């Protein structure tokens, strides 16, 4: 169902969460070789999450589930904020700009934490 597909999507989100927090530790430790690898891993995860989310939204639309569509339209808009900040973080790492990397990192955390109440509301709406 769309609901199982959302639980599948949620798990990918939590995996990216887990990797993100291991990457932060590595960055703080200066282990750039680890950071580079975790940034690759997070890119692949977010790319997969984004695609699963699109499929869920399209299915909610085909189902006529107006409330779930409203919530998913907002949730995906927030996701794209995250993706933009993530991409800026990756560029800061490429550039050696640790000040920008720290900034982007904390912003990506706050953006993600905010969007959590909506993430749970979608689960209940589908």
Ligand X SMILES: Cc1cc(CO)c2ccccc2n1
Task: Name the site residues for ligand X (rule: CB under 6 A).
Answer: 13, 16-17, 45-46, 49, 78-79, 82-83, 111-112, 115
Helix (H, G, I), strand (E, B) or coil at 30: coil
Please, which residue, 1 or 117, has the CB nearer to ligand X? 117
Residues 6+ apart with CB under 8 A from 79: 49, 50, 53, 115
Q: Considering the complex, state which of residue 14 and residue 64 has its C-beta at the smaller distance from ligand X.
A: 14
Q: How far is the CB of 55 from ligand X (least distance, A)?
A: 15
CB of 21 vs ligand X, minimal distance in Å: 12
d(CA 39, CA 34): 9
Using alpha carbons, select from 57, 69, 70 the residue that is nearest to residue 6: 57
Least spacing, CB of residue 103 vs ligand X, in Å: 16
105: Cα separation from own chain's centroid: 12
* CB nearer ligand X, residue 26 or residue 45: 45
CB of 115 to ligand X, least distance (A): 5
Cβ distance 24 to 105 under 8 Å? yes
> Measured at CB, which residue is nearest to ligand X?
82
């Amino acid at each position: 169902s769309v609901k199982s597909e959302y639980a599948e999507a949620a798990a990918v989100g939590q995996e990216a969460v887990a990797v993100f927090n291991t990457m932060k530790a590595a960055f703080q430790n200066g282990d750039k070789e680890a950071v580079a690898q975790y940034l690759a891993r997070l890119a692949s995860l977010y790319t997969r999450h984004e695609e699963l989310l699109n499929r869920i939204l399209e299915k909610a639309r085909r189902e006529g589930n107006k409330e779930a569509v409203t919530l998913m339209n907002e949730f995906t808009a927030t996701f794209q904020t995250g993706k933009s900040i993530f991409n800026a973080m990756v560029a800061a790492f490429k550039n050696g700009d640790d000040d920008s990397f720290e900034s982007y990192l904390q912003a990506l955390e706050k953006v993600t934490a905010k969007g959590e109440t909506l993430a749970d509301q979608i689960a209940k709406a589908l």
